[PDB]
């Protein structure tokens, strides 16, 4: 009744705080989950993320992103949905296990590339898990969702794998996708591990209703319909990707920097093609060279905040050091004179 699962597994993944892979759908049977990221199976902060064809066979069906983290093993504190995008909905799941999921309506398209990048980080004694998606054709990043997990010092510790799964039982319907550009950032040294070599493996060694292979460009895999394995129970394949990933640049324009009636307003906009914002800080100096100590500091500007409005007492001539950093820890600093009129 069900298409067999297919797993694509890096040979060399390690404990990571950033995990990234590129995915392209080819055939999209309904009730298919491409979980392109998986971590900590059976463990603290177990989770996954990817793409679902929830209904229909094509773009006119319900196409989504998915993100889930299982409830803490010991802590009684709830996982919080800290941030959901305009098309994202956070809900608690149940059945044999419980936790938090974010489902995001997202009009992804056949034969287009989608880069799903997850980051885990420590903030206020908790671990945050964030989901970002680059639409490669549009050259546009979007922040999808951030979960606040009430246990410190958890990360994408083990179990990196992708799966394609039929969750309803329509093994007659073929599902096929491609992946490339798998990378993790190591907890050990903050350097990148390249998943250049991956195994493609059917879930059931006795079920051959799936197939896989690689071009010089991508790994591909399918299951269901007339799929029949050309690679036995599984096979390993190498892509010629660079050992360090090609990371774009953080690029933004300051839109306002003015002080009026004891209120400081500073706003910015990342360029359409920029890497996405991870955090911000603004130091305010009483001198152009920004020597000595700032007279004031605005800390803990979040990934989802593109400005500040603060009641503050300043002298005549103030200068703002705007320090933004992207999800890849690239920092871009601008120095702007604060204007004393809106």
């Amino acid at each position: 009744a069900s298409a067999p699962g297919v797993y694509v597994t890096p040979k060399n993944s390690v404990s990571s705080d950033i995990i990234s892979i590129d995915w392209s759908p080819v055939q999209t049977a309904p009730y298919t989950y491409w979980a392109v990221h998986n971590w900590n199976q059976g463990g603290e902060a177990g989770g996954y993320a990817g793409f679902q064809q929830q209904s229909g066979f094509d773009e006119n069906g319900k196409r989504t992103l998915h993100f889930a983290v299982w409830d803490p093993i010991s802590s009684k504190e709830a996982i919080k949905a800290e941030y959901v995008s305009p098309t994202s909905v956070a809900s608690n799941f149940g059945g044999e296990g419980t936790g938090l999921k974010i489902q995001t309506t997202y009009d992804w398209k056949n034969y287009n590339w989608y880069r799903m990048t997850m980051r885990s980080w420590q903030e206020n004694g908790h671990t945050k898990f964030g989901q970002w998606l680059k639409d490669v054709s549009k050259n546009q990043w979007k922040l999808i969702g951030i979960m606040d997990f009430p246990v410190p010092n958890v990360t994408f510790n083990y179990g990196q794998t992708l799966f394609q799964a039929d969750w309803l039982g329509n093994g007659q319907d073929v599902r096929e996708a491609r992946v490339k550009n798998g990378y993790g950032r190591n907890i050990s040294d903050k350097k990148w591990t390249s998943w250049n070599t991956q195994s493609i493996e059917g879930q059931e060694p006795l079920n051959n209703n799936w197939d896989g292979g690689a071009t010089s460009e991508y790994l591909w895999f399918k299951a269901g319909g007339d799929s029949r394995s050309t690679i036995g129970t599984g096979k390993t394949f190498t892509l010629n990707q660079p050992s360090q990933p090609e990371i774009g640049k953080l690029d933004y324009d300051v839109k306002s920097t003015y002080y009026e009636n004891e209120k400081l307003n500073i706003t910015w906009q990342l360029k359409d093609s920029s890497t996405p914002q991870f955090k911000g800080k603004i130091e305010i100096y009483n001198n152009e060279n920004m020597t000595g100590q700032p007279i004031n500091v605005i800390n803990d500007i979040k990934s989802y905040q593109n400005g500040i409005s603060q009641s503050i007492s300043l002298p005549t001539n103030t200068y703002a050091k705007i320090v933004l950093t992207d999800i890849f820890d690239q920092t871009v600093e601008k120095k702007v004179k604060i204007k004393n009129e809106s």
């Binding site: 797993y7 009730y31 989950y33 979980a35 998986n38 199976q41 059976g42 463990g43 177990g46 996954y48 998915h66 059945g95 044999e96 083990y158 179990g159 794998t161 799966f163 799964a165 969750w167 309803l168």
Partner: peptide
């Protein structure tokens, strides 16, 4: 009642 389970850890 849809479920989307995951692989078990290695023993």
């Amino acid at each position: 009642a849809a479920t989307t389970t995951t692989p078990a850890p290695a023993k």
